[PDB]
Write an enzyme that holds these catalytic residues in place. Structure first.
Site, mmCIF file in Angstrom:
data_model
loop_
_atom_site.group_PDB
_atom_site.id
_atom_site.type_symbol
_atom_site.label_atom_id
_atom_site.label_comp_id
_atom_site.label_asym_id
_atom_site.label_seq_id
_atom_site.Cartn_x
_atom_site.Cartn_y
_atom_site.Cartn_z
ATOM 1 N N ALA A 180 0.756 -1.247 0.000
ATOM 2 C CA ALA A 180 0.000 0.000 0.000
ATOM 3 C C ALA A 180 0.794 1.310 0.000
ATOM 4 O O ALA A 180 0.324 2.335 -0.503
ATOM 5 C CB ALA A 180 -0.928 0.005 1.227
ATOM 6 N N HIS A 203 -0.169 -2.456 8.897
ATOM 7 C CA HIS A 203 -0.137 -3.028 7.555
ATOM 8 C C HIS A 203 1.068 -2.545 6.755
ATOM 9 O O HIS A 203 1.299 -1.329 6.646
ATOM 10 C CB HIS A 203 -1.410 -2.629 6.811
ATOM 11 C CG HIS A 203 -1.579 -3.399 5.498
ATOM 12 N ND1 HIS A 203 -1.839 -4.692 5.315
ATOM 13 C CD2 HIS A 203 -1.487 -2.822 4.251
ATOM 14 C CE1 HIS A 203 -1.907 -4.921 4.017
ATOM 15 N NE2 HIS A 203 -1.692 -3.793 3.410
#
Ligand SMILES: *[C@@H]1O[C@H](CO)[C@@H](O[C@@H]2O[C@H](CO)[C@@H](O)[C@H](O)[C@H]2NC(C)=O)[C@H](O)[C@H]1NC(C)=O
Ligand SMILES: *[C@@H]1O[C@H](CO)[C@@H](O)[C@H](O)[C@H]1NC(C)=O
Ligand SMILES: *[C@H]1O[C@H](CO)[C@@H](O)[C@H](O)[C@H]1NC(C)=O
EC number: 3.1.1.3
Length: 544
Positions: free
Chosen positions: A132, A463
């Site tokens: 991401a 994450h």
């Protein structure tokens, strides 16, 4: 002296010796997807490899800048205040890069121990990116640390990384693409890269009969879709394309149809931002999109990210893998549950706080009605009753939300920890448990990484963080992410010659799970938030 390998019996390519690792970067595996081939499935490479100087990374495929997300996060919580400098430096380094981005990006890279000969039959590790906050496609993931550590371990591997098209360039849906049969082009890119490895890796000293595919975030979601591709048929001309897999923070997606975030179809929004007239026929809108310059389509992709994914939501919720009746023949969850998956051993795991980096999208929510409205946008076809049940299973009580196990700390807003827990479990933890309970006839291992617990305010063990230890600075839990995965690529068991804690395999009876800390690991069981995660696994009415 440049290392060499010969492809197709007589075409010689040369690479670059980097210390004790031979690298061959920028090898084409398909024809460039330009002009009339934009948005189509990858076409065979029709050129020549003779005399290729594979000495630098190719352009990254078209993608958004990590800076969009990092700046929103920084605005929302002040990254220089919350992330320790020793992790923050690496994180920003992976978010920038020297490679250009270009639609002509279908290339792969091979990394191997210096002096390996074509007869060596070394196990192959194939990395599929999807981080991401990372910029650069395969250029951000050099294989040198994995190869160097496999030599120190006495278990040398070949590392391969593959570029594939993401976003609207690789997953444009809509009726015109469906009529052409060109759906899920980015997944076909990955599969074509794997065919190239099966056909050619022996020339580099790799074993085509022992290939492990692994990746993180959208790359692990991609690996999960490769396991159910064509209903579990991972063969190419009689040969299996891969023999084991590792999924770092990603799994199957819960869609049963081509849905996306929000009230509108993603194709229609992108066509509109590109300046195409959305009242024309489907074939005409696609023809208009194929005539736009790359800069116009890049701006259109950027507008969809900022306006429709609010700069932070996982990209595959907008343009991503969807059932198309061919490479993904049915909903991903249902393919795993009916046994229509490739029968290979795998490791699947998560970081403890997967949802905290995505939770700032709902920063303005202070009450349960406000959270319900944000969930009704992200999951637009969800039944109201299904959303109401999620909200009763995940209460606003500060101590039970994420960053997990931090009591009343980290409550950036009244609802931040609640939204972080919901996004964690809906998008990452439930997909992992769907696979682990469905694939009962293969060996599997699972992990929870808690190594930044209480070191990073508001984000926790977030994450994408572990990529800096695998690919940038080999500190902290780097030895677990390097050595267990090298052992797994070699022996399909993570415990050979690691000099690390024995990691027991996951069984349906004991649900064994490794817990990874900064310097030590401990065995635990995958027993947390069973009611909340189970409901995400089974409530079909949530998804659309
Ligand atoms: C939080 O922000 C979102 C996004 O701006 C607000 O939701 C929008 O509200 C307007 C008016 O109701 C709608 O036209 C938009 O379509 C909504 N978008 C989304 C994504 O929901 C929301 O109202 C804000 N919440 C609070 C408490 O202010
Ligand atoms: C649209 O394109 C498809 C695939 O190229 C073709 O078969 C179909 O006839 C076209 N239809 C129209 C209405 O233009
Ligand atoms: C390419 O040339 C190198 C000499 O630098 C040689 O060692 C190697 O064997 C050649 N590649 C193959 C597969 O013959």
């Amino acid at each position: 002296q440049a290392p060499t390998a010969v492809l197709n019996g007589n075409e010689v390519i040369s690479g670059v010796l980097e210390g004790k690792v031979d690298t061959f970067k920028g090898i084409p595996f398909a024809d460039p997807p330009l002009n009339d081939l934009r948005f189509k499935h990858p076409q065979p490479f029709t050129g020549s490899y003779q005399g290729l100087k594979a000495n630098d990374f190719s352009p990254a495929c078209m993608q958004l800048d990590p800076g969009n997300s990092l700046t929103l996060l920084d605005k929302a919580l002040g990254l220089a205040k919350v992330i320790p400098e020793e992790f923050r430096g690496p994180l920003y380094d992976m978010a920038k890069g020297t490679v250009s981005m270009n639609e002509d990006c279908l290339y792969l890279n091979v990394f191997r121990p210096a002096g390996t000969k074509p007869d060596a039959k070394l196990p192959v590790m194939v990395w599929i990116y999807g981080g991401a906050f990372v910029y650069g496609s395969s250029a951000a993931y050099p294989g040198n640390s994995y190869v160097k550590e496999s030599i120190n371990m006495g278990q040398p591997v070949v590392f391969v990384s593959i570029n594939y098209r993401t976003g609207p360039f690789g997953f444009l849906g809509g009726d015109a693409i469906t009529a052409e049969g060109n759906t899920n082009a980015g997944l076909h890119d990955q599969r074509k890269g794997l065919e190239w490895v099966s056909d050619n890796i022996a020339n580099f000293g790799g074993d085509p009969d022992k290939v492990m595919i692994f990746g993180e975030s959208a790359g692990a979601m991609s690996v999960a879709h490769q396991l159910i591709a064509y209903g579990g048929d991972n063969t190419y001309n009689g040969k299996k394309l891969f023999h084991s897999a590792i999924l770092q923070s990603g799994g199957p997606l819960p869609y049963h149809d081509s849905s996306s975030v929000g009230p509108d179809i993603s194709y229609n929004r992108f066509a509109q931002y590109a300046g195409c007239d959305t009242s024309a026929s489907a074939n005409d809108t696609l023809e208009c999109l194929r005539s736009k310059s790359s800069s116009v389509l890049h701006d259109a992709q950027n507008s969809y990210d900022l306006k429709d994914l609010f700069g932070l939501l996982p990209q595959f919720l907008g343009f991503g893998p969807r059932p198309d009746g061919n490479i993904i023949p049915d909903a991903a969850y249902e393919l795993f549950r009916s046994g229509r998956y490739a029968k290979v051993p795998y490791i699947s795991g998560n970081q403890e706080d997967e949802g905290t980096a995505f939770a700032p999208v709902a920063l303005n929510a202070t009450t349960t009605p406000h959270v319900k409205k944000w969930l009704q946008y992200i999951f637009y076809d969800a039944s109201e009753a299904s959303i109401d049940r999620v909200l009763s299973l995940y209460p606003q009580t500060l101590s039970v939300g994420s960053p997990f196990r931090t009591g009343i700390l980290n409550a950036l807003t009244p609802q931040f920890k609640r939204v972080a827990a919901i996004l964690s479990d809906m998008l990452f933890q439930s997909p992992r448990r769907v696979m682990l309970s469905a694939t009962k006839d293969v060996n599997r291992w699972t992990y929870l990484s808690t190594h930044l617990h209480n070191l990073v305010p508001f984000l926790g063990t977030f994450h994408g963080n572990e990529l800096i230890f695998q690919f940038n600075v080999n500190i902290g839990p780097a030895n677990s992410y390097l050595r267990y995965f090298i052992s797994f690529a070699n022996h399909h068991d993570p415990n050979v010659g690691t000099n690390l804690l024995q990691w027991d395999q996951y069984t349906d009876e004991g649900k064994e799970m490794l817990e990874i800390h900064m310097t030590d690991n401990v065995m635990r069981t995958d027993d947390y938030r069973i009611e909340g995660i189970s409901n995400f696994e089974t409530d079909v009415n949530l998804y659309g």
